[PDB]
């Protein structure tokens, strides 16, 4: 399989077919699915590492939307990446203005 | 219907062997993968059109990744993509 050959977890064949059927271009090179799949897997691993850390700090084992939102907003670079993105049932970051604090 | 749920779970077991994931979280992450895939494909499509080229290749993907990602995220995704391509051709 092309995913095992590439050394990844994401479906290189499915990604290739999506690239060819998404009407992005007339032709798709053979290395582009590998590149895109590697990037997708890396970004997923980043999010899940941070979210698992938040879940563990929360004394829970199951990652939930609150943990995902906590990880994303705590990470500044990922906050920039997912700027105009709402995460359902995610909430907000706890913060209060110091002037409002007594 | 098809989804990235199984591969996302595989990555999750790679990074946190003892941790579950709820269906809402999996749906959110499936949406995230779809959105980022659409963004990178769109940027590489625009690049290939700007260059009067009819092929999306690893160079187009790498440039799209560098355009979409901030700092360390881009610098590390580029390395992951390069390693994957190198290994894939070597095998």
């Amino acid at each position: 399989s092309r995913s095992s050959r590439a050394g990844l977890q994401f479906p290189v064949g499915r990604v290739h077919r999506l690239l060819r059927k998404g009407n992005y271009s007339e032709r798709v090179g053979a290395g582009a699915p590998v590149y895109l799949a590697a990037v997708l897997e890396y970004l997923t691993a980043e999010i899940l590492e941070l979210a698992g850390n938040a879940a563990r700090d929360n004394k829970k084992t199951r990652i939930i939307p609150r943990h995902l939102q906590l990880a994303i907003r705590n990470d500044e670079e990922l906050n920039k990446l997912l700027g105009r993105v709402t995460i359902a049932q995610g909430g907000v970051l706890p913060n209060i203005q110091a002037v409002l604090l007594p | 219907k098809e989804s990235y749920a199984i591969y996302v779970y595989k990555v999750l077991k790679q990074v946190h062997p003892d941790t579950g994931i709820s269906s809402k979280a999996m749906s959110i992450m499936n949406s995230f993968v779809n959105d980022v895939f659409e963004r990178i494909a769109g940027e590489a499509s625009r690049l290939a059109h700007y260059n009067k080229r009819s092929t999306i290749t690893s160079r187009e993907i790498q440039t799209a990744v560098r355009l979409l990602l901030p700092g360390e995220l881009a610098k590390h995704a580029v390395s992951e993509g390069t390693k994957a391509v190198t290994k894939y051709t070597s095998a």
Binding site: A45, E46, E49 | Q14, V15, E72, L73, H76
Partner: peptide, 4 residues
């Protein structure tokens, strides 16, 4: 798997 090179993470940050």
């Amino acid at each position: 798997m090179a993470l940050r």
